[PDB]
Amino acid sequence: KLKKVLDKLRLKRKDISEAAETVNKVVERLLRRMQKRESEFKGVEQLNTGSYYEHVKISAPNEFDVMFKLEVPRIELQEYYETGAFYLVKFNPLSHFLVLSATKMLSKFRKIIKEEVKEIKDIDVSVEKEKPGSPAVTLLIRNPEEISVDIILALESKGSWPISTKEGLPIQGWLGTKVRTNLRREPFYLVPKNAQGETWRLSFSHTEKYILNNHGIEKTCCESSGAKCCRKECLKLMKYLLEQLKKEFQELDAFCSYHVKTAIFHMWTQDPQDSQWDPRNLSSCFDKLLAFFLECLRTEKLDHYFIPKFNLFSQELIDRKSKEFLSKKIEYERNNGFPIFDK
Amino acid sequence: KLKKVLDKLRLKRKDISEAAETVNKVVERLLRRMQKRESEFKGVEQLNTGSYYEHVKISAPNEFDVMFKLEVPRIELQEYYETGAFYLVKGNPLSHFLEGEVLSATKMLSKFRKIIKEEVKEIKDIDVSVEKEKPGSPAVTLLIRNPEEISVDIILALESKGSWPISTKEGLPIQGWLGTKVRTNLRREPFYLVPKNAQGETWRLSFSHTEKYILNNHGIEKTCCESSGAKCCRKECLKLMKYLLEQLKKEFQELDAFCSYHVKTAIFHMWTQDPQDSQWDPRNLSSCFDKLLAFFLECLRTEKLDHYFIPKFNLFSQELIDRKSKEFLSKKIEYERNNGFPIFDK
DNA sequence: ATCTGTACATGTACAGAT
DNA sequence: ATCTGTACATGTACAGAT
DNA sequence: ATCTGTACATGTACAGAT
DNA sequence: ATCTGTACATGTACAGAT
Ligand SMILES: Nc1ncnc2c1ncn2[C@@H]1O[C@H](COP(=O)(O)O[C@@H]2[C@H](O)[C@@H](COP(=O)(O)OP(=O)(O)OP(=O)(O)O)O[C@H]2n2cnc3c(=O)[nH]cnc32)[C@@H](O)[C@H]1O
Numbered sequence: 211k212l213k214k215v216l217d218k219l220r221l222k223r224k225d226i227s228e229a230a231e232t233v234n235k236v237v238e239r240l241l242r243r244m245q246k247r248e249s250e251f252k253g254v255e256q257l258n259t260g261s262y263y264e265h266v267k268i269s270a271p272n273e274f275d276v277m278f279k280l281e282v283p284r285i286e287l288q289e290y291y292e293t294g295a296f297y298l299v300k301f302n303p304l305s306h307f308l309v310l311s312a313t314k315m316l317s318k319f320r321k322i323i324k325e326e327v328k329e330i331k332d333i334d335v336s337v338e339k340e341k342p343g344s345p346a347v348t349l350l351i352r353n354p355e356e357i358s359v360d361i362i363l364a365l366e367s368k369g370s371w372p373i374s375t376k377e378g379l380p381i382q383g384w385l386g387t388k389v390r391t392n393l394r395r396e397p398f399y400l401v402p403k404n405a406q407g408e409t410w411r412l413s414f415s416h417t418e419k420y421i422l423n424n425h426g427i428e429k430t431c432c433e434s435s436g437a438k439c440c441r442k443e444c445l446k447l448m449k450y451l452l453e454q455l456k457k458e459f460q461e462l463d464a465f466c467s468y469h470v471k472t473a474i475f476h477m478w479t480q481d482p483q484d485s486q487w488d489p490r491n492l493s494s495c496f497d498k499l500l501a502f503f504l505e506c507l508r509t510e511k512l513d514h515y516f517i518p519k520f521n522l523f524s525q526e527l528i529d530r531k532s533k534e535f536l537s538k539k540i541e542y543e544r545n546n547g548f549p550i551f552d553k
Numbered sequence: 554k555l556k557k558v559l560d561k562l563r564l565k566r567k568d569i570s571e572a573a574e575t576v577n578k579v580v581e582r583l584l585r586r587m588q589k590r591e592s593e594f595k596g597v598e599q600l601n602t603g604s605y606y607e608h609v610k611i612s613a614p615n616e617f618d619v620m621f622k623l624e625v626p627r628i629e630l631q632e633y634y635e636t637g638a639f640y641l642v643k644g645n646p647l648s649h650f651l652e653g654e655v656l657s658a659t660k661m662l663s664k665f666r667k668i669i670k671e672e673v674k675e676i677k678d679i680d681v682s683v684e685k686e687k688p689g690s691p692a693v694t695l696l697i698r699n700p701e702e703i704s705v706d707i708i709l710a711l712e713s714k715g716s717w718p719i720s721t722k723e724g725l726p727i728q729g730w731l732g733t734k735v736r737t738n739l740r741r742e743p744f745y746l747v748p749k750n751a752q753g754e755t756w757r758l759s760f761s762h763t764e765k766y767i768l769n770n771h772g773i774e775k776t777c778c779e780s781s782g783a784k785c786c787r788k789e790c791l792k793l794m795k796y797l798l799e800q801l802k803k804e805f806q807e808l809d810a811f812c813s814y815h816v817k818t819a820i821f822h823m824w825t826q827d828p829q830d831s832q833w834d835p836r837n838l839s840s841c842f843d844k845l846l847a848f849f850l851e852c853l854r855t856e857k858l859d860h861y862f863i864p865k866f867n868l869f870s871q872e873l874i875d876r877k878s879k880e881f882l883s884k885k886i887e888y889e890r891n892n893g894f895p896i897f898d899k
Numbered sequence: 900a901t902c903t904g905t906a907c908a909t910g911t912a913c914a915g916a917t
Numbered sequence: 918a919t920c921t922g923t924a925c926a927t928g929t930a931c932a933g934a935t
Numbered sequence: 936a937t938c939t940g941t942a943c944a945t946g947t948a949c950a951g952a953t
Numbered sequence: 954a955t956c957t958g959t960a961c962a963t964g965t966a967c968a969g970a971t
Pocket residue numbers: 259260261262266267268273275344345346360362401403411412413414415449466467468471
């Protein structure tokens with residue numbers, strides 16, 4: 211039933227092989243260009259993020275997310291009002307992006323990438339028209355197949371995480387206090403998503419990657435000498451429900467995969483035991499996930515998992531209309547055996 | 554009953570405070586000295602090991618173990634006659650300890666020892682001498698007196714960052730317990746060679762750093778023994794077993810061949826055999842301790858206790874310990890077991 | 900003026916003390 | 918149930934060296 | 936400072952056993 | 954239908970060499 215759906219959603223090794231071989235060619239070349247040429251981004255380092263690298267990518271290997279992270283000296287943050295997620299950066303190579311302007315820096319980053327792509331004749335690859343606000347430089351590759359790659363500029367700070375995250379990452383009952391303390395000793399990242407043009411947003415893609423690949427209360431969850439859980443499978447099913455709904459109804463344009471990822475982090479925290487995510491109980495697990503996501507919509511509350519004061523479902527970010535709309539559509543699919551899965 | 558014993562065994566904060574304040578003074582000074590002038594041990598780094606740093610030290614804070622580890626690039630090992638544990642190592646600073654390519658353990662240890670003795674002489678803050686050398690030991694042992702007697706084993710160590718030696722490939726069977734990711738990461742840590750004998754150029758592998766990790770990350774659940782997790786009795790069983798041996802050892806010299814490492818090894822095997830945190834419930838301390846004794850007794854009777862990291866190395870081989878010694882310890886354990894542990898009452 | 904090995908600053912888990 | 922000392926990991930400041 | 940080699944985890948694909 | 958074993962593929966951390 212849902213096994214049958216996950217089978218459809220499963221990526222093929224051949225497709226993975228071909229898609230990766232190309233994406234890596236391009237990314238390696240873009241990365242080479244940032245240092246081996248005397249740009250402001252010399253020393254920038256690669257960090258693969260998102261669904262493909264978490265092993266929760268569904269349908270096809272056609273969307274890849276990569277951080278080009280840049281370690282910066284002693285940095286001063288100032289929270290953009292009380293948003294929790296957005297900051298101004300303050301205090302050498304970067305002088306010419308001065309307060310460090312996100313858009314000015316992103317523009318140069320973008321300009322370089324556009325130049326390097328022009329010089330690529332191996333592969334059919336253009337640079338997508340800029341979406342204002344967005345921190346990505348998006349590449350549209352065509353093998354025969356359409357593949358998109360988000361190159362995300364990132365500042366890496368080695369200081370302790372900003373105050374807004376102090377109560378974030380409530381993994382203590384699930385992954386534990388040692389894991390949490392160690393995770394919060396990793397750097398934090400700022401990406402140039404706006405709000406305006408000088409605002410950066412916190413990024414925990416590196417932390418989310420760790421969590422995805424170390425998601426059990428037991429150290430052996432999903433390992434060769436351990437028991438398989440269905441945590442990732444539920445994430446996939448939920449992602450697919452949204453993807454399918456999103457491509458049918460334009461009313462759902464305000465919703466994205468990060469909403470679902472956030473909700474399931476909360477579910478995993480609420481239901482820490484690996485036994486509460488037994489493969490045999492895939493149906494009820496998926497169901498309790500839907501129920502939870504519906505409560506978030508109804509209460510208009512979905513807190514950033516790392517930044518509790520940042521509500522992704524705040525009125526200011528998404529209309530009541532949009533939420534009620536998605537509620538009805540989810541409720542419908544739920545109470546009619548998920549017809550949309552059959553497409 | 555056993556809670557009451559563990560209460561006695563528990564260290565006091567006051568004693569910990571005083572003992573540590575002194576030990577650290579001495580060790581910091583000894584370590585500072587190694588970095589001086591054209592010392593062959595410049596770059597040597599500190600790594601605290603053993604029971605005190607694993608939180609399984611019992612009775613008093615009176616024995617501390619410290620590795621002074623020294624990174625040695627481009628190093629070639631040759632296993633000493635298929636033993637698994639022992640190896641030969643082959644204007645550089647260590648040049649002075651070589652015998653045509655071969656790094657002498659004893660020559661190196663001797664210099665190490667000489668330096669330490671010299672540095673201790675110059676300490677008048679604290680009452681601290683250097684214990685007479687124990688044959689078949691890699692340690693330089695300090696006897697500090699505070700008022701109270703405290704000993705500190707300074708252990709010379711080579712640090713190699715290469716892959717662990719072949720003999721350990723089947724070692725550390727933690728896959729069903731701590732997992733494959735933990736194991737892979739652990740085996741990416743360096744391995745250590747200490748100058749224990751067999752001859753004067755032989756070194757022995759050391760996994761004290763790994764054992765420390767295991768002790769402090771001993772559960773199948775990541776929250777085992779944490780503030781938002783469930784307490785197990787794994788460490789408590791180790792303490793009780795250590796105490797049984799310590800008490801027996803200081804009464805009967807027949808038990809001189811036995812050490813705390815034997816019990817530590819046995820319990821690593823027990824933890825592997827019983828991976829679930831529920832199999833080590835605090836409420837079931839008695840049966841947990843009992844199954845541990847039963848296991849240790851089987852090891853003695855079958856004369857088999859494999860090094861947890863080096864499976865082919867049997868710590869209870871006839872060549873290391875007499876049948877007599879094992880049977881003796883068997884009877885004494887069996888006795889304590891079947892008479893309510895009278896020796897705990899001392 | 901810049902660079903650096905060393906010491907310190909900051910944070911938390913663990914366990915003992917209250 | 919809360920509070921506190923020690924160990925340990927990671928970041929950063931800086932007197933002495935260059 | 937950069938690059939390659941090695942080991943193994945997380946996947947997929949599929950046959951034979953249950 | 955599911956489970957187990959093997960083969961094949963990609964990702965990633967880190968050591969040793971340059
Ligand atoms: N903080 C960030 N760290 C890393 N990458 C980021 C971050 N913020 C944004 N990005 C990347 O920028 C591109 C566009 O982002 P938008 O902010 O315009 O909207 C995001 C996007 O449309 C959607 C899905 O993101 P992603 O492709 O990473 O999803 P996935 O988890 O890989 O799954 P699938 O590819 O299978 O769907 O989510 C939106 N979004 C909103 N907030 C966030 C956030 O904090 N992190 C990530 N996405 C977010 C994208 O490439 C995005 O990754």
